[PDB]
Design a protein around this ligand. Structure first.
Ligand SMILES: Nc1ncnc2c1ncn2[C@@H]1O[C@H](COP(=O)(O)OP(=O)(O)O)[C@@H](O)[C@H]1O
Ligand SMILES: [Mg+2]
Length: 814
C-alpha cells in the first residue's frame, strides 16, 4: 500500500457521479415509453463487462429515473457512488440506513444486461423476499425478470400486482414522483397515489430453475450454496438448477463473508432408518461364520463376504441378489454389523460407559465423548452392544462460503462495517473496501466505553441506564451476544417494571415488524445478535428531541465490526442518536487481553466499587485490543481456510468426475480404466522387480466373486502376461453381463457409480474432519494436513474403483 487508495477511488467516483447527474436532465424529460426503449437499446449494446463500462453512465441514470418514477425514491449521489464500487467488484461500505438496497439496483441492472444472471445475496428468506419486492418495480419497469429463492424449495418471480394497470401507467406517462418537485426526497403528501397503486408488485411461484433463468435472482447465502451442493447430488445432469456463477453482490457482506463463513455450509437430511433394522442386523451378523461366510482383512480393516456368505445373507434377508441396486442399504447394513462385531473391540477401539458408546481416539489414546464413527458404524456398534441407538443426520455435501463465492466471475459486497477488516476481504476474496461518505453528517454521540470490574455491576448499571432512558422517554436498543444474556436482562427489567421486547434473531419477518417500532417514545428493545438486522428504525414523534435512539452494547466483541453494526442502528440519515458500550474485566474480550492492565489502573485511580472507569485513552486501548485479537483470530482462521481449500480441490475433482459420469452414454472407457487400475496396482505391488508373490496378489483380489480368476495352477512368463490375464477375465465377464442384462445395464452402472462415489465421498469427509481437528490441536499444520489428506484421498480412490469393479460384476447376476 503506497498511497491513499480510498481517496484515489472516490476522486474518480465523484467525477462519474457528476456525469451521471448531467444525464439526468435529459432522461427526466423523457416519457416512460422512451426510457423503456432506451433499456432495450442498452440490452442490445451490453453483452460483456467491456460493453457495460461503455454504457455505465446511461444505465445508472436510467435506473435512477426508473426508481424515482416507480418508487418515489431518487438515489442520492452517495448511493450512485456505492453502485459504482459494486460494479467494480469491491466492497461498498455504506453505513446502516444509507440505502444499500436501492444503491445495488444500478450495478444489478447494468450487469444483468449481459444476460448471464446476477445474484443478490442477503442473510435470510425474509430479507430476500423483501428486497426483491421493494426494488421489483424498478427492474420490471426496465424489462428485467426478477427471481427469488427461499428455503424449503420455495421459488418466486416478482410480477406486477395488476399487469394491465402497470401497463397503462407505463404507456401513459405516470410517475409516483410528480413533475416539478426538485427535492432530494419526496414528502408523502406529494406521492401520486394512482402511480403507487399501478406499480405494486407481488410474488408468483415458479420452479427453482426458472428463478435462476431470471435476469436477477434474489436469495440467501445458504440457499445459493445449497443449490450448488444439490446440483452435485443429482442423478440426471439436466436436474441442475444453477447456470454458472457470473456476478454476485453480497449484502451484509461481513456477516456472510466473514461471520457466517466461519463454519462450512453443510447439506444434511434425516437417515429415515429405524433403530430396529440396526438391531436386526446385529442379530443377523451373529449367524455368520468367520472364514466360512466371510473373511476379515485386519490390515485393510475390511470384511469380505464369501460365496457361501452372500448365499446365507440372501436366504436370511431375504432377496435374490444382495448386490442388486435396490439392495444397497441391506448390503451396507450387513457389512457394518459384521465390521462392528469383528473389527471393533470393546476396551480397545471404544468403550461402553453408562449406556453409551465412546471412541478411544487413536491419535491421543483419549476418549472423545459425543463424537461418532462415520457411516452408521456407530449405530452398528450401539446395536452390537445392545445400548440405545442414537439418531444421525446424513451429511450429503459440504462447501465453504469462501470457496462458493470465489466461483463468481465478479464478486462485490455491501455493508456498513468492512474497512476495519479490509485485508480479510482482500486476501480471502480479492475485494478491496471503498468507504462511501454518508448522505448526511453523522452526528450520533458515540460515548467513551464504560469498564466495570465485574459483570454483576456492569449489568446492574445497564439496567439503571435503561430505567433512566425509559423514564425520559428516549428509546433504547440493547444489544447482547446470546439469548441467555438477553433473557437475563429481560428478567432484570421485568423486576424493575420496565416494559420491553426481546428479539432473539429467530423469527425474521416478525422481529422486523417489531424492531421497526423500536424508535418510538418509551420503547425498550433487547436484540440478541443483531436481531431485526436490515430493518430501518425511524424515530417516532418527539424522539429526536430526546437525543434520538440510544444504543447500549452490553459487551464488546472480538471483532469491532460487530460492535459498529450495533451502534450504526442509531443516527441513520443524520438523525441524532447515541451509543454506549459497557464492558467488565470479567468479559470474554478483556479476559483475552487487557483485564489485568485495566484492573491495575482502576485500583490506582481508586475507582469506586460498582463504578466504571471511562476515558478516551481507555476507549483507544480497548480498540487496540480488538485490533490485536482480530489479527490473531484472522491468522488462525486463515490456517483453517488453507486446510479447507485442500479439501476443496479434492471436492472439485470428485464433482468433475461425477458430472462426466452423468454426461457419459457408454462406460466402456471408464471401466477399462478402472479394471486397469484394479489389476495394475496389485501386479506392480506383488510382481514387479524381484517380487513374485502370486499368493498375496490372489488374496488382494479376494473381494471379487469366485469364478473370475484361477491363479492357483498357472505359470505366467511375466508380469505382463499376468496383468493381461487378470484384465481380460474382468473384461470378458463385463461383456458377458452386457449380453445377459441388455442395454439397461448402462443405467444400472451409472446408478451404482454415483452411489458408490457419493457414499465414499460422504464418509471421507467425516474422516478428514477428524484429521482436521487432530492436526489443529497438535499445533506448520498445513503441510502435515496436506500429506495426510493425500493418503486418505488416494485410498478412497483405490476403494471407489475396487467397489465399482466388484459391484458391476455382481449386480443382477442369476
Ligand atoms: N434515495 C432515497 N430516497 C428516499 N429514501 C430512501 C432512499 N434510499 C433509501 N431510502 C430509505 O432509507 C432507509 C434505509 O434503507 P435501507 O436500504 O434499509 O438501508 P441500508 O441497507 O443501507 O441499511 C429506508 O427507510 C429506505 O426507504
Ligand atoms: Mg440493508
Amino acid at each position: 500500500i503506497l498511497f491513499d487508495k480510498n481517496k484515489r477511488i472516490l476522486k474518480k467516483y465523484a467525477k462519474m457521479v457528476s456525469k451521471i447527474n448531467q444525464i439526468e436532465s435529459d432522461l427526466r424529460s423523457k416519457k416512460n415509453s422512451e426510457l423503456i426503449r432506451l433499456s432495450m437499446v442498452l440490452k442490445e449494446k451490453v453483452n460483456s463487462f467491456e460493453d457495460a463500462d461503455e454504457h455505465l453512465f446511461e444505465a445508472f441514470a436510467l435506473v435512477r429515473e426508473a426508481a424515482r418514477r416507480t418508487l418515489g425514491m431518487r438515489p442520492f449521489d452517495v448511493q450512485v457512488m456505492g453502485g459504482i464500487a459494486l460494479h467494480e467488484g469491491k466492497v461498498a461500505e455504506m453505513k446502516t440506513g444509507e440505502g444499500k438496497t436501492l444503491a445495488a439496483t444500478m450495478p444489478i441492472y447494468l450487469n444483468a444486461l449481459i444476460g448471464k444472471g446476477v445474484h443478490l445475496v442477503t442473510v435470510n428468506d425474509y430479507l430476500a423476499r423483501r428486497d426483491a419486492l421493494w426494488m421489483g418495480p424498478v427492474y420490471l419497469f426496465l424489462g428485467l425478470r426478477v427471481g427469488v429463492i427461499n428455503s424449503l424449495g420455495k421459488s418466486y418471480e416478482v410480477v406486477w400486482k395488476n399487469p394491465d394497470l402497470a401497463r397503462k401507467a407505463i404507456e401513459e406517462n405516470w410517475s409516483v414522483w410528480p413533475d416539478g418537485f426538485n427535492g432530494e426526497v419526496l414528502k408523502e403528501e406529494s406521492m401520486n397515489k394512482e402511480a403507487v397503486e399501478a406499480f405494486q408488485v407481488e410474488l408468483k411461484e415458479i420452479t427453482r430453475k426458472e428463478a435462476y433463468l431470471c435476469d436477477v435472482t434474489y436469495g440467501t447465502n445458504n440457499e445459493f450454496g445449497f443449490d450448488y451442493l444439490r446440483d452435485n447430488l443429482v442423478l440426471d445432469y439436466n436436474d441442475k438448477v444453477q447456470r454458472g456463477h457470473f456476478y454476485a453482490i453480497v449484502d451484509e457482506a461481513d456477516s456472510v463473508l466473514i461471520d457466517e463463513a466461519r463454519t462450512p455450509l453443510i447439506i444434511s437430511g434425516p437417515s429415515k432408518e429405524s433403530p430396529s433394522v440396526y438391531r436386526r442386523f446385529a442379530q443377523i451378523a451373529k449367524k455368520f461364520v468367520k472364514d466360512k461366510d466371510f473373511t476379515v482383512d485386519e490390515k485393510a480393516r475390511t470384511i469380505i463376504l464369501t460365496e457361501e456368505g452372500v448365499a446365507k445373507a440372501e436366504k436370511i434377508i431375504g432377496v435374490e441378489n444382495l448386490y442388486d441396486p435396490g439392495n444397497v442399504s441391506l448390503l451396507y447394513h450387513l457389512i457394518n454389523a459384521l465390521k462392528a462385531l469383528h473389527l471393533f473391540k470393546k476396551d480397545v477401539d471404544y468403550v461402553v460407559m453408562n449406556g453409551e458408546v465412546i471412541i478411544v481416539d487413536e491419535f491421543t489414546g483419549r476418549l472423545l465423548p459425543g463424537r461418532r464413527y462415520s457411516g452408521g458404524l456407530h449405530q452398528a456398534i450401539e446395536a452390537k452392544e445392545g445400548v440405545p441407538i442414537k439418531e444421525e443426520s446424513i451429511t450429503y455435501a459440504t462447501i465453504t462460503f469462501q470457496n462458493y463465492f470465489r466461483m463468481y466471475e465478479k464478486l462485490a459486497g455491501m455493508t456498513g462495517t468492512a474497512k476495519t477488516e479490509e485485508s480479510e476481504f482482500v486476501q480471502v476474496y480479492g475485494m478491496e473496501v471503498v468507504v462511501i461518505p454518508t448522505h448526511k453528517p453523522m452526528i450520533r454521540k458515540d460515548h467513551d466505553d464504560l469498564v466495570f470490574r465485574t459483570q454483576k455491576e456492569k449489568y446492574e448499571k445497564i439496567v439503571e441506564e435503561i430505567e433512566k432512558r425509559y423514564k425520559k422517554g428516549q428509546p433504547v436498543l440493547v444489544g447482547t451476544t446470546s439469548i441467555e444474556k438477553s433473557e437475563l436482562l429481560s428478567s432484570m427489567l421485568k423486576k424493575k417494571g420496565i416494559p420491553h421486547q426481546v428479539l432473539n434473531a429467530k423469527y425474521h419477518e416478525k422481529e422486523a415488524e417489531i424492531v421497526a417500532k423500536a424508535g418510538q417514545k418509551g420503547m425498550v428493545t433487547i436484540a440478541t445478535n443483531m436481531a431485526g438486522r436490515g430493518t430501518d428504525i425511524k424515530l417516532g414523534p418527539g424522539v429526536a428531541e430526546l437525543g434520538g435512539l440510544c444504543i447500549i452494547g452490553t459487551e464488546r466483541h472480538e471483532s469491532r465490526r460487530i460492535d459498529n453494526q450495533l451502534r450504526g442502528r442509531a443516527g441513520r440519515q443524520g438523525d441524532p442518536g447515541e451509543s454506549i458500550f459497557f464492558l467488565s474485566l470479567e468479559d470474554d474480550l478483556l479476559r483475552i487481553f487487557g483485564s489485568e492492565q485495566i484492573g491495575k489502573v482502576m485500583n490506582i485511580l481508586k475507582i469506586e466499587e460498582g463504578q466504571p472507569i471511562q476515558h478516551p485513552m481507555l476507549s483507544k486501548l480497548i480498540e487496540n485490543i480488538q485490533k490485536k485479537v482480530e489479527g490473531i483470530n484472522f491468522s488462525i482462521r486463515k490456517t483453517l481456510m488453507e486446510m479447507d481449500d485442500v479439501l476443496d480441490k479434492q471436492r472439485r475433482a470428485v464433482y468433475s468426475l461425477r458430472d462426466q459420469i452423468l454426461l457419459e452414454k457408454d462406460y466402456d472407457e471408464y471401466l477399462k480404466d478402472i479394471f486397469e487400475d484394479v489389476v495394475s496396482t496389485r501386479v506392480e505391488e506383488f510382481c514387479s522387480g524381484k517380487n513374485w508373490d502370486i499368493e498375496s496378489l490372489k488374496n488382494s483380489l479376494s473381494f471379487f466373486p469366485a469364478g473370475l480368476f484361477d491363479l492357483d495352477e498357472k505359470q505366467f512368463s511375466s508380469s505382463e502376461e499376468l496383468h493381461d490375464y487378470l484384465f481380460n477375465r474382468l473384461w470378458e465377464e463385463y461383456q458377458r453381463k452386457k449380453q445377459e442384462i441388455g442395454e439397461d445395464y448402462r443405467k444400472v452402472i451409472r446408478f451404482l457409480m454415483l452411489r458408490i462415489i457419493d457414499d465414499h465421498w460422504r464418509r471421507y469427509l467425516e474422516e478428514v474432519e477428524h484429521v482436521k481437528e487432530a492436526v489443529q490441536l497438535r499445533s506448520d499444520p498445513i503441510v502435515e494436513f496436506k500429506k495426510e489428506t493425500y493418503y486418505m484421498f488416494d485410498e478412497m480412490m483405490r476403494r471407489i474403483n475396487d467397489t465399482i469393479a466388484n459391484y458391476v460384476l455382481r449386480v443382477l447376476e442369476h
